[PDB]
Amino acid sequence: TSALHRAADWAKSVFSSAALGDPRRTARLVNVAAQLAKYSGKSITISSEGSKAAQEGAYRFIRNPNVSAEAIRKAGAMQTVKLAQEFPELLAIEDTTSLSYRHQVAEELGKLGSIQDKSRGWWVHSVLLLEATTFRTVGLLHQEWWMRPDDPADADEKESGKWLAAAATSRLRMGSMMSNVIAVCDREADIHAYLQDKLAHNERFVVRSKHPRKDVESGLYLYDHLKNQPELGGYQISIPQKGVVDKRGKRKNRPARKASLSLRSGRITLKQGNITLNAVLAEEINPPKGETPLKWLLLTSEPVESLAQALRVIDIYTHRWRIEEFHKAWKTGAGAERQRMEEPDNLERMVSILSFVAVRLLQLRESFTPSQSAETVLTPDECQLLGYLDKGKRKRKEKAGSLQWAYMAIARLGGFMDSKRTGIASWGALWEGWEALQSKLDGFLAAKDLMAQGIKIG
Amino acid sequence: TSALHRAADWAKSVFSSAALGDPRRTARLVNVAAQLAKYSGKSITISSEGSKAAQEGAYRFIRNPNVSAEAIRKAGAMQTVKLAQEFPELLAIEDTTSLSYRHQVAEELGKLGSIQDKSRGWWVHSVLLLEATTFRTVGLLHQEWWMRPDDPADADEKESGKWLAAAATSRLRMGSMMSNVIAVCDREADIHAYLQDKLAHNERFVVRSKHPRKDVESGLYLYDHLKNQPELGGYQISIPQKGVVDKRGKRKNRPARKASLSLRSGRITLKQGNITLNAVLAEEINPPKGETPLKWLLLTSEPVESLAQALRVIDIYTHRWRIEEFHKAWKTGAGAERQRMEEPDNLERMVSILSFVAVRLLQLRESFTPSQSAETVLTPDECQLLGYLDKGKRKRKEKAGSLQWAYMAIARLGGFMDSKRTGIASWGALWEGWEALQSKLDGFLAAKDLMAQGIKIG
DNA sequence: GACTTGTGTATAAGAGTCAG
DNA sequence: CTGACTCTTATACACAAGTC
DNA sequence: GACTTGTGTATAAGAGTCAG
DNA sequence: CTGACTCTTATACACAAGTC
């Protein structure tokens, strides 16, 4: 938030809490995180700016047997917890991804596909906290890493307990801030035991419905009972073009279209556990000749009885993609799967660090997104150089010297050409832009310095 | 050479000759090559520096049906031919690589593996010219692109004729400069018809021996006849550590070692075609308990009768890897296989351009490699900024302000940490460094400009 | 000349990718 | 998932700059 | 204290990758 | 191919800064 742009400051805030059992490890962590963040996406070596000291330090740290990766992730998360004190409502977006490897260490790791696959590694189940008003990323609350065994009957616990394990960690970490938190999960979380545990702790959630369950008071499947309700009202959406590549490698187009949805809600009770909760059902009115009609059924602790309360629910769900965006920031962006440590713990400690770097990529774009001047975000020196680099390229929409102009200017330095006329640049473009602006800033300052000590330039 | 660092200048020299049948196409080619070179490795869009004009231009050019990719490659090659006038002896390193794709266009392309593979594309057979004294890259003389058919009996010509086809093109292109040229090829070129054609044109070559052929005057296999000769003398080599990954995915180490070789030569005559030529044989004296003894048998037009003449031959061959280095510069570096044009000709015209970009990556490092001052290569402004950026990092080996220091300084800006204490940075590190130095130079100049118009910085 | 192609602008959307 | 994007191929105009 | 771990330097080499 | 590299994991010293 306040400590973001300056990588060293950022790393102190995230990591100085870490109980690694020696302040030298925590300071080292801080330094390491700092160089990696300044060089998001690149090798440790490249992050060391030619310092043999820092290179050696970084590598010694991530193979350090007194350094607990669990503790690294926990220390970051407590920072999230500290940050989250700022907000009256939060979303806790929850999902699993895989971290996949094929080098020699992969065989010491866990199953991701078939027993024979060379690609092995970890499953990580993550909780990403956003603030609920403007949806900005607060950070990681929780990650469970595990190695799936080759033999399913060697599992200590069933993988589906990951949703409850996460709840247990969030509540513990958030403490009394938990009633502030709304857990968002997809169909994998449509587990009776999971809904039950939330309600029992009086915790808050929006989980999408997969299994047809019956409502006690009507004796009907949730869907049939919800279709009985009066039309709470409607909403139309725009579905954006994209290409599509199926599981067998087959490519098709998905042309943009506009769909319109009828919304309904109701209070519902489930046979199992005699647990009561609410549910919203959005369904498409008159879909075109040959397309899957849209259909969302959402299970929620949240109020649903007014049209607006129900839209709050839909839109809380519409932000679920954000956890995938983190996964992409972790992998493609920060380089989790590009690492090549030769031992599991080494690979873990590194990739642990990289998860908070990932979050910061997200937050960097978010730091520029939202009315007034560029000076609120950039330094005076940053502000002038950007103005020079951008000369001519500024569009008429953009108020001169505004934070909106600063967003675009950086995006353009990152390569952004708005190919879909949406105005929105990827976090990847913003990062390249920021990094470019920062790199050109070295030269700018170097001239300033020399010019300040009375030396002629060129 | 002279026109290299400045991308626009470089592109004019390489491409202003192009007969595309409209000077507008040639100028467009020049512009396109220029932006791509300035942004080696990145997308067309990113290369357009926010110019909608240049983006649209670039894309219109590479889907232009009046633009012949053949002609693009030819125009570059004639520049090579023009450059090569400078040199009294050249190496023409010759080999094939594949350009491989899996997007929708791939199925309109040719076979690279089995009939069923999704990975399809072209085979390209290339001739890379170096000068023979200090081995610097002069450029591409020739490329043959073709699509291997699914059915081997649908081939217009056998693929092994590629060595002769290349000879035919080089001689035509080099004209009377051909007697300056020494063709270097590996075992695939150990074809009787190919040796014969060289000798008949009185062209010059070093080709490694695969098939046991017999010498007429002795009646012995080349190898047995060469082992009869007196020990012309010896030479020892250092073999550098590397990892090894076999075809089935199996990983092993190859530890560094020192090998010593005994050298022999002789004049030889082959039964077929009663063609006479020379041959050198290098073979390892007493290899360690369990390792493949080294063994090179080279067929050559070149003189071989003195120890030194024979070493000239070995070392001419020892530079064969350079064609692989080009292939890597073309693919990984310039991004040939990262392109995603949706039509073969579009994909070809683009990748054609990218092959000369590749060559320039090689030449950029080479432009810094070899006694005196940095000022011989960099501009005064470039020279100062680099000196600032490098403050503290300079080693004692490095004479202050020398071209040797400039090499290291750039390498360090590119991430180079000399992990194998060899002093040699990859072309990839030099490029990142150069690009970084260039990027920081924008800021430096921007401060200069503003400082020159009397505006306060920061 | 008679007719054809490239540029710079502006509008639109198909194809591809990651991760799923 | 109603993902979110960038890469790539289009199309129209007026008008400039080509071939023939 | 008695004993154990991190830093900055310097030396070395195994493991991995591309393209083959 | 005797490829050429970068990434990663080592090891010793003296000495500083930790745990117990």
Distance CA A136, CA A359 (A): 11
Asked, colleague to colleague, whether B68-343 and B344-449 share their fold, the answer is no
A10, A83 contact by CB (below 8 A): no
Is residue A283 packed enough to be buried (19+ CB in 10 Å), middle (13-18) or exposed (0-12)? middle
| B422 closest-nt by C1' vs CA | F5
CB neighbour list of residue A200: distance below 8 Å, 6 or more residues apart:
none
Q: Please tell me whether any atom of strand E lies within 7 Å of the Cβ of A118.
A: no
Distance from CA of B389 to the nearest CA of A (A): 8
Distance CA B135, CA B86 (A): 13
First to last CA, chain A: 39
Distance from CA of B426 to the nearest CA of A (A): 14
Percent of residues in chain B assigned helix, strand, coil, to nearest 5? 45, 20, 35
User: Given B104, B412, B444, which is nearest A444 (Cβ)?
Assistant: B444
Q: Please tell me whether any atom of strand E lies within 7 Å of the Cβ of A104.
A: yes
| A235 closest-nt by C1' vs CA | D2
> In 3D, which of A88, A67, A316 has the Cα closest to residue A208?
A316
String of DSSP letters for A337-358: GG---SSHHHHHHHHHHHHHHH
Domain assignments of chain B as residue spans, ordered by start: 1-67, 68-343, 344-449
Cβ contact, residue pair A443, B385, below 8 Å: yes
Is residue A346 packed enough to be buried (19+ CB in 10 Å), middle (13-18) or exposed (0-12)? buried
- CATH class, B1-67 region: mainly alpha
B207, B190 contact by CB (below 8 A): yes
| A318 closest-nt by C1' vs CA | D2
Chain-centre distance for alpha carbon B381: 31
Q: Please tell me whether any atom of strand D lies within 7 Å of the Cβ of A318.
A: yes
B218, B294 contact by CB (below 8 A): no
> In 3D, which of A216, A214, A260 has the Cα closest to residue A236?
A260
Q: Please tell me whether any atom of strand D lies within 7 Å of the Cβ of A236.
A: no
Distance from CA of A395 to the nearest CA of B (A): 12
- Nearest residue for D6, CA–C1': A419
Contacts of A430 in chain B (CB under 8 A): none
User: Given B103, B388, B415, which is nearest A45 (Cβ)?
Assistant: B415
A142, A47 contact by CB (below 8 A): no
User: Which bases of chain D come closer than 7 Å to a protein CB?
Assistant: 1-11, 17-19
CB neighbour list of residue A293: distance below 8 Å, 6 or more residues apart:
A283, A284, A287
Distance CA A38, CA A334 (A): 11
Strands B90-101 and A276-284: unpaired
Distance CA B62, CA B154 (A): 29
Distance CA A372, CA A403 (A): 6
Distance CA A411, CA A432 (A): 8
Per-residue DSSP letter, A428: H
Q: Please tell me whether any atom of strand D lies within 7 Å of the Cβ of B82.
A: no
Give me the total of CB pairs closer than 8 Å, taking one residue from chain A and one from chain B: 112
Q: Calculate Rg over the CA atoms of chain A.
A: 24
Q: How far is CA B209 from CA A301, A334, B285, in A?
A: 78, 48, 20
Distance CA A129, CA A363 (A): 12
Is the torsion defined by CA of A190, A192, A195, A197 positive or negative? negative
Helix (H, G, I), strand (E, B) or coil at B141: strand
Distance CA A182, CA A128 (A): 11
Give chain A's length.
Answer: 458
A405, A383 contact by CB (below 8 A): no
> In 3D, which of B331, B320, B356 has the Cα closest to residue B428?
B331
Q: Does CATH number 1.10.740.10 belong to domain B344-449?
A: yes
B185, B205 contact by CB (below 8 A): yes
The residue with tokens 């934070």 is A403
Q: Please tell me whether any atom of strand E lies within 7 Å of the Cβ of A338.
A: no
Cβ contact, residue pair A388, B45, below 8 Å: no
Distance CA B188, CA A434 (A): 50
- A340 CA – E14 C1', rounded, Å: 13
Rounded to 5 degrees, φ, ψ at B413 are: -65, -20
Distance CA A116, CA A108 (A): 13
Distance CA A79, CA A356 (A): 11
Cβ contact, residue pair B440, A436, below 8 Å: no
User: Given B45, B440, B458, which is nearest A439 (Cβ)?
Assistant: B440
Distance CA A312, CA B392 (A): 58
Q: How was this structure determined?
A: X-ray
Contacts of B249 in chain A (CB under 8 A): 118
- CATH class, B68-343 region: alpha beta
| β-pair partners for B110 | B121
String of DSSP letters for A62-106: HT-TT--HHHHHHHHHHHHHHHHTT-S-EEEEEEEEEEEE-SGGG
User: Which bases of chain F come closer than 7 Å to a protein CB?
Assistant: 1-11, 17-19
- Nearest residue for E9, CA–C1': A53
- B348 CA – E19 C1', rounded, Å: 20
CB-side neighbour CA atoms (13 Å) of A435: 17
Helix (H, G, I), strand (E, B) or coil at B121: strand
User: Which bases of chain C come closer than 7 Å to a protein CB?
Assistant: 5-20
Residue type at position A148: R
Contacts of B48 in chain A (CB under 8 A): 417
A106, A138 contact by CB (below 8 A): no
> In 3D, which of B251, B317, B299 has the Cα closest to residue B91?
B317
| β-pair partners for A237 | A259
Per-residue DSSP letter, B440: H
> In 3D, which of B165, B160, B166 has the Cα closest to residue B192?
B160
Distance CA A30, CA A13 (A): 9
Distance CA A177, CA A25 (A): 30
- Nearest residue for F17, CA–C1': A24
The token duo for A259 is 């769909």
Distance from CA of A208 to the nearest CA of B (A): 34
- A21 CA – F17 C1', rounded, Å: 13
CB neighbour list of residue B232: distance below 8 Å, 6 or more residues apart:
B263, B264, B265, B306, B307, B310
User: Given B412, B419, B448, which is nearest A447 (Cβ)?
Assistant: B448
Helix (H, G, I), strand (E, B) or coil at A418: coil
- A93 CA – D4 C1', rounded, Å: 17
Distance from CA of A65 to the nearest CA of B (A): 24
| B105 closest-nt by C1' vs CA | C15
Contacts of B412 in chain A (CB under 8 A): 50
Is the torsion defined by CA of B133, B134, B135, B136 positive or negative? negative
Cβ contact, residue pair B46, A450, below 8 Å: no
Rounded to 5 degrees, φ, ψ at A234 are: -130, 170
Per-residue DSSP letter, A308: H
| A51 closest-nt by C1' vs CA | E8
Cβ contact, residue pair A384, B441, below 8 Å: no
- Nearest residue for E10, CA–C1': A52
> In 3D, which of B289, B320, B315, B293 has the Cα closest to residue B302?
B315
